[PDB]
Amino acid sequence: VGHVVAQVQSVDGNAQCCDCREPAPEWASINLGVTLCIQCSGIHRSLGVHFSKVRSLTLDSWEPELVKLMCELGNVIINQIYEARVEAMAVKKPGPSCSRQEKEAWIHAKYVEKKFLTKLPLHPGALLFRASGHPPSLPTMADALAHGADVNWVNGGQDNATPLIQATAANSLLACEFLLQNGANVNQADSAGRGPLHHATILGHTGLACLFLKRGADLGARDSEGRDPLTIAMETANADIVTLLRLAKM
Ligand SMILES: [Zn+2]
């Protein structure tokens, strides 16, 4: 709520549109972590939610975690990834005055075709998994995802844990939020049937528990020990999480 557009635009390179450098962009992509002008945000709407989730900095409400998330990413960071090879390819980015068509071609090459990426972010999924854990590196998570990292990557042969479960073990609201904006299944369990909600409640992370409930975590899911999150909350003597879970059931 605290002027979102002022705060988000005050971040490194966020006062130029990410795709065409149009000044004072008032739009955003919340899974990418970037600001966009009227023209480029309109084009992002073309791509679909898998590539880009468009929001207004001035006209839409913003959850505080999400503002903070925007502040750890930003145009400079994201362009270091998505436009990494532009200089080496000798190709020319659009400016503010360019044709809709020219911006369309650039945006599609950049985000769909992934044409300007470096070759390596060798294992994008494992990199995402590592970068989501304590202490998380959101630029590294962004780089891994741009290189095709599965947001629901399973750490096989080991514990079958996911990046979301790692971000949960790290107590990282930001990394959790980032993964969820990028399609993480809030219900995907590890080998012991313990989903992100189970982990939040094992570790006494009330904020993360509340985050997962807001995003449709299954209240009734039972782990390999037959425990749902309420049972873990009782057994850990955690009055706040018991309260949450009981309220969520109502
Ligand atoms: Zn633009």
UniProtKB/Swiss-Prot annotation:
Residues 2-250 are annotated as: Required for interaction with GULP1. A zinc finger (C4-type) spans 17-40. Coiled coil: none annotated. One of its GO terms (cellular component) is recycling endosome membrane. ANK repeats lie at residues 159-188, 192-221, 225-250. Keywords: ANK repeat, Endosome, GTPase activation, Membrane, Metal-binding, Nitration, Phosphoprotein, Protein transport, Repeat, Transport, Zinc, Zinc-finger. Changing T58A: No effect on interaction with ITGB1. It comes from the Eukaryota. Highest level in lung and spleen. Low level in heart, kidney, liver and pancreas. Banana-shaped homodimer laterally assembling into tetramers, the tetramers further pack helically onto the membrane. Interacts with GTP-bound ARF6. Interacts with third cytoplasmic loop of SLC2A4/GLUT4. Interacts with CLTC. Interacts with GULP1. Forms a complex with GDP-bound ARF6 and GULP1. Interacts with ITGB1; required for ITGB1 recycling. PH domain binds phospholipids including phosphatidic acid, phosphatidylinositol 3-phosphate, phosphatidylinositol 3,5-bisphosphate (PIP2) and phosphatidylinositol 3,4,5-trisphosphate (PIP3). May mediate ACAP1-binding to PIP2 or PIP3 containing membranes. Only one PH domain of one ACAP1 dimer inserts into the membrane, while the other PH domain acts primaryly to interact with adjacent ACAP1 dimers. The BAR domain mediates homodimerization, it can neither bind membrane nor impart curvature, but instead requires the neighboring PH domain to achieve these functions. Cells overexpressing ACAP1 show an accumulation of ITGB1 in recycling endosomes and inhibition of stimulation-dependent cell migration. Cells with reduced levels of ACAP1 or AKT1 and AKT2 show inhibition of stimulation-dependent cell migration. Cells overexpressing ACAP1 and PIP5K1C show formation of tubular structures derived from endosomal membranes. GTPase-activating protein (GAP) for ADP ribosylation factor 6 (ARF6) required for clathrin-dependent export of proteins from recycling endosomes to trans-Golgi network and cell surface. Required for regulated export of ITGB1 from recycling endosomes to the cell surface and ITGB1-dependent cell migration. This is Arf-GAP with coiled-coil, ANK repeat and PH domain-containing protein 1. It comes from Homo sapiens. The chain holds residues 404 to 697 of 740 of the full protein.
